[PDB]
Amino acid sequence: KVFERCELARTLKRLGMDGYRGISLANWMCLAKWESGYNTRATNYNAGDRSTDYGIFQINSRYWCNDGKTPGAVNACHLSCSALLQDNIADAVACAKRVVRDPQGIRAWVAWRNRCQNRDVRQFVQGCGV
Ligand SMILES: [Cl-]
């Protein structure tokens, strides 16, 4: 499913992402936008290290979910990577919460550093009623 901006904004708020571990809703929106374009079925194979990024938040199979084919990987979210490709983002959200529970926080995603950090991100939630 390809989420519409405000539709996604409201969904994340309901799932309790606003201010989770100090991260504003607008930052989560910026992350989803640059990682997948709000697309839940987005998958990206990294031929460089044999891992794959899954779903709306492009969560990596090396540490977070299990896809069985990534070498020396763990499954911190305790989920099959397939769970991260559903239209319902409840699981992807539970896993993203797990990711940011680590010391790096939102910085775990290099894309956030490149396109969201130190920028005016208000635009992602304007007019959405959140
Ligand atoms: Cl699962």
Ligand SMILES: [Cl-]
């Ligand atoms: Cl599994």
Ligand code: NA
């Ligand atoms: Na894994």
